[PDB]
Amino acid sequence: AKRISILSRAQSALNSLPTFQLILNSNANQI
Amino acid sequence: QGTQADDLVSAIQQNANHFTELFCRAIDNNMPLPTKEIDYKDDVLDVILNQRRLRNERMLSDRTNEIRSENLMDTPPSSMNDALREVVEDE
Structure with missing residues (x-):
């Protein structure tokens, strides 16, 4: 995301970027 | 010439320890390429x-x-x- 948060906002015309959250979904067996 | 210049001499005389690193940065920014090539008689x-x-x-x-x-x-x-x-x- 740091590579995306630099190469995008500097081209489509300070910024601190936090640690991203992992959200993960499964379709397997439900206990 | 008429243009405005800061007193670099007095600023160096007052705070020379900072201006050593500033001059080193300025020198490293504009360093010519070596005409000579590296040979086996150069320093380590x-x-x-x-x-x-x-x-x-x-x-x-x-x-x-x-x-x-x-x-x-x-x-x-x-x-x-x-x-x-x-x-x-x-x-």
Whole structure:
């Protein structure tokens, strides 16, 4: 995301970027 | 000439320890390429520094090439190169 948060906002015309959250979904067996 | 210049002499005389590093930065910014080449009669420190400069160039080129190989948005060439060198020298 740091590579995306630099190469995008500097081209489509300070910024601190936090640690991203992992959200993960499964379709397997439900206990 | 009539243009306005700061008193660099007095500022150096008051705070010379900072201006040593400022002058070193200015010198390193504008350093001519060596006309002579590295030979076996050069100093060990010189060839160490030459290898460090070549290493810095190689990691810069490798990081730029890997990031270009990613193509992380598949898209303005000059602005692309500016943001590209900005992210490469930062990483």
